[PDB]
C-alpha cells in the first residue's frame, strides 16, 4: 500500500 504514511 503506497498510501501508508511514509513519515515519522
Amino acid at each position, epitope marked *: 500500500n*503506497p*498510501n501508508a*504514511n*511514509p*513519515n*515519522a
Partner: antibody
Amino acid sequence: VQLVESGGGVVQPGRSLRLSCAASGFTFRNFGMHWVRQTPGKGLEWVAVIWHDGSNKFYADSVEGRFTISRDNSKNMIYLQMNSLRVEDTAIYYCARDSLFYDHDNSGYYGYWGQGTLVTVSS
Amino acid sequence: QIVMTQSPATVSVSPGERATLSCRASRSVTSKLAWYQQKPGQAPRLLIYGASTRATGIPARFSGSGSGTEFTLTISSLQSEDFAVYFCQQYNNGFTFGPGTKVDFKR
C-alpha cells in the same frame, strides 16, 4: 523550507541519468519524500515515494524496474536513478515533501515543492 | 489507476467574482484530495488538503468542499493574484492528478 533539484539535461534514449534534490530548513529524517514529473501534454504525474528512512519505496507503473529512488539522511538528500530511458520520460521532475504537519490519517499530499529540473530524452 | 477529471478546462472570472472549479474521481477517494495552484514557470503550491482544510498562508477566499467522487474548489471573490491553473490530486489509492483548470481574466 527549501528543496532544490538538479542533475537534469539532455540524454539519448536507452541511456541513464541520476537526479539529486537537496533539502533544507526542516527535519529531513522525519519525512518521506516524493518525485513528481510534469509534461506539457500529460500534465502532472507522480513518479515514486521513499519512506522517511529508506525502508519502503513505491514507484509509478510507468517506471517500475527502470527508476530507483534513494535518500541519505546524513546528507539531507534524495536521489533518483533512471535506467533505460524512453523519450516518453521527458518531463520536468519536481522534488516534493509529504505532508504539511505530521499525521497518520492525513498524508499523501505535497506540502512543499522544489523548483524542478528538466530531463529531455531525445536522439 | 484512479482518474481525476476536472471541468471546465477554462473559467473566465473578473476580480471580485466567485469562481467554482469541479473535480471528479473515477472511484471514491473519501476525503483524501488536495488542490494546487500553479503559475507559468513556477512550481505548484499547496492550497487545500483533506477536502476542506486550508494550508498555512492561504487566504480565506479559497474553500474546498466535497466527499467521495465529487469535489469543488471555490474562490469566493477572486483577486489579482489568483489567475493561474488549479490541479486536484487524490491520495486515497495511489497518487493521481487532474488535468487542471485554467482561470483567466474575463473580458
